[PDB]
């Protein structure tokens, strides 16, 4: 029994799963697979021209 | 075959039950109601649907609700003389404008339940 | 006679009152099922777009 | 306009099929019930 | 509040149910019919009786005339539908008329003069404190349990589609069709004449009305069911009048109700249930209509001969593409199944707001039902 084992409205945050457009799946996995924020934020040489220049 | 077996099993089962368990209850509340004005005089009716039959007692229990003298009724003991004295008790309730639907003497004589129901309940609504 | 057909009176309603119930259960399976259906087929949808 | 104006707003689904299922358990259970009284 | 139970009253053209609100099956149910008698009477002494009513007008039909007061879902006569009224109230029931409300059921597409002489007559003559007139089709769907679907509703009167998709229904896309199964009795008391067989008064309909609810069946394949007719007996089948004679039906079991599918049998022009259906999925928008596919509901007498769902899905199947699942959603109790939406109606907390008050009448005549209601 899969289906006694979760159910779609005990989690509003697993509710979102039913309800996704395939392309926003990938979309989605895609952009936390390349970590871009992450990226610019780790890498120094960048952060402090674009904090001193703000 | 099989959903019209379960639409026969449905409409026998249901449709049954609730209305025989209702015209019980009505049965007893108005045999009651019936026992409490006929006792003034000496007389008293043990089922609703036989005793009624013969014309007489209806005669009678219209006497005391009423107030007036109703004709004495048929000297007899047939069918025809049973339907002369429903016929008569139909006739004073003519009188005083109760609508009476669906009613006639045979159907009184012959003992349809609903409609005996149905006549001891208008009665009931008038003289009330 | 009479004695007869009342208790066989008795039998066909202890016997409906047994039907019911596989009716009843009967209309919760597929009640069931139709869920799993739906379930099924999107998610092989997703996987073939994957 | 007036597209609504037969029926009343922000009422909750669930309450009409809560009775529903109440009305479908009344044969299941096959109780009897007389009339009410007048 | 709590104890009163307003009442619900289905009224078709063959046939009225009435029961109590919260009940899943009716109390009374009898056919609307009113019957006068023709010959001498010569008996003195055994009361007159001007008018038969209901069930009891059907067990001595032998010398009475019958007349139905509804026809094509249209109160023609005014006077027997009170008869009728009178009698489901107080020998039906015994309640008297002013301690609860009342909800009547039509159809959808009515002259506005019946609408308003309903409502002038419960609140005039029966004196009602709240009154409610509903669609049947709509109702329906409230016994199935469902948001969206389309139903079919196919009485003895009239037949009629409407589409409801979320709570919403279409009124463009309401179709109505005048071949229901009084028609279907009167093709079936024609086609019972070349085999020797002759019903001519009404009360002979009655036993032709019996004959069709007991032989009949909808073939799945017109012409191969023929050919099986032709070539073999054995679809064959006897019943017994009331005088004890004994007829043989045969061929005809199936071609009584496919006069619902193909309208040109008795000669109309317009186009069979399944058709009509599939027309007025297709009046919809295209968003829906695939939820549409998937939630035909069938309902009223009509449709309890044996095969006719498997017919229809064949049929929808055909027309529909192919890449969309059909099926027929048909409940062993799709006969009272408008009586039970009226109740699942009736006994809703928020319904309360929606009857219509007696003062309201008064105050604005018996046009108060076209701004509620539907
Ligand atoms: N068991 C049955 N099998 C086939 N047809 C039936 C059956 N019962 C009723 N009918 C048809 O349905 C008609 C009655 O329909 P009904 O449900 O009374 O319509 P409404 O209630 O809307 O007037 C009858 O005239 C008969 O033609």
């Known amino acids: 029994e899969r289906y006694f084992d979760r159910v779609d409205e005990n989690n509003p945050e697993y509710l979102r799963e039913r309800n996704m457009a395939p392309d926003l799946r990938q979309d989605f996995n895609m952009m936390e697979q390349k970590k871009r924020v992450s990226m610019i934020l780790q890498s120094p040489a960048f952060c402090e021209e674009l904090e001193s220049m703000i | 075959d099989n959903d019209n077996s379960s639409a026969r099993l449905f409409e026998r089962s249901r449709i049954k039950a609730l209305a025989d368990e209702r015209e019980v209850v009505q049965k007893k509340t108005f045999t009651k109601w019936v026992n409490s004005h006929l006792a003034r005089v000496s007389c008293r009716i043990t089922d609703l649907y036989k005793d009624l039959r013969d014309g007489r007692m209806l005669i009678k229990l219209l006497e005391v609700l009423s107030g007036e003298m109703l004709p004495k009724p048929t000297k007899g003991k047939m069918r025809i003389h049973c339907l002369e004295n429903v016929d008569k008790a139909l006739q004073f309730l003519k009188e005083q404008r109760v609508h009476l639907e669906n009613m006639g003497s045979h159907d009184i004589v012959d003992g349809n339940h609903r409609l005996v129901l149905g006549l001891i309940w208008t009665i009931i609504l008038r003289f009330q | 006679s009479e004695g007869q057909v009342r208790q066989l009176e008795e039998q066909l309603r202890i016997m409906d009152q047994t039907l019911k119930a596989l009716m009843a259960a009967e209309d919760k399976y597929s009640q069931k099922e139709d869920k799993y259906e739906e379930e099924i087929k999107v998610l092989s949808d997703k996987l073939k777009e994957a | 306009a007036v597209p609504n104006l037969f029926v009343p707003l922000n009422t909750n689904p669930k309450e009409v099929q809560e009775m529903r299922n109440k009305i479908r358990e009344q044969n299941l259970q096959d109780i009897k019930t007389a009339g009410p009284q007048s | 509040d709590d104890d009163i139970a307003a009442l619900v009253v289905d009224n078709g053209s063959g046939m009225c149910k009435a029961g109590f609100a919260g009940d899943d099956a009716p109390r009374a149910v009898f056919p609307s019919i009113v019957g006068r008698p023709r010959h001498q009477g010569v008996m003195v002494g055994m009361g007159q009786k001007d008018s038969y009513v209901g069930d009891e007008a059907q067990s001595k039909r032998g010398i009475l005339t019958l007349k139905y007061p509804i026809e094509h879902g249209i109160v023609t006569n ?7 009224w009178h009698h489901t109230f107080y020998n039906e029931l015994r309640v008297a008329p002013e301690e609860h409300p009342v909800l009547l059921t039509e159809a959808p597409l009515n002259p506005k003069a019946n609408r308003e002489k309903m409502t002038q007559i419960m609140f005039e003559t029966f004196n009602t404190p709240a009154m409610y007139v509903a669609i049947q089709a709509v109702l329906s769907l409230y016994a199935s349990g469902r948001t969206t679907g389309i139903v079919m509703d196919s009485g003895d009167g009239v037949t009629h589609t409407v589409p409801i998709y979320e709570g919403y ?18 093709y079936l008391m024609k086609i019972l004449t070349e085999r020797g067989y002759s019903f001519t008064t009404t009360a002979e309909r009655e036993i032709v009305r019996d004959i069709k609810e007991k032989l009949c069946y909808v073939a799945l394949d017109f012409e191969q069911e023929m050919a099986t007719a032709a070539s073999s007996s054995s679809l064959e089948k006897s019943y017994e009048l009331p005088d004890g004679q004994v007829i043989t039906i045969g061929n005809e079991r199936f071609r009584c109700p496919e006069a619902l599918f193909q309208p040109s049998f008795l ?41 006719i769902a498997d017919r229809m899905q064949k049929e929808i199947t055909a027309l529909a593409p192919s890449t969309m699942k059909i099926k027929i959603i048909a409940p062993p109790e799709r006969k009272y199944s408008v009586w039970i939406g009226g109740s699942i109606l009736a006994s809703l907390s928020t319904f309360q707001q929606m009857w219509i008050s007696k003062q309201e009448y008064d105050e604005s005549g018996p046009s108060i039902v076209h701004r509620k209601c539907f």
């Open chain 5, 78 to 84: 005014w006077d027997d539908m009170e008869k009728i």
């Open chain 5, 169 to 186: 229904a279409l009124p463009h896309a309401i179709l109505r069709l005048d071949l229901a199964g009084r028609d279907l009795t009167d």
């Open chain 5, 267 to 307: 000669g109309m022009e317009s186009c069979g249930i399944h058709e009509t259906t599939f027309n007025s999925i297709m009046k919809c928008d295209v968003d829906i209509r695939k939820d549409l596919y998937a939630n035909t509901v069938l309902s009223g007498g009509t449709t309890m001969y044996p095969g």
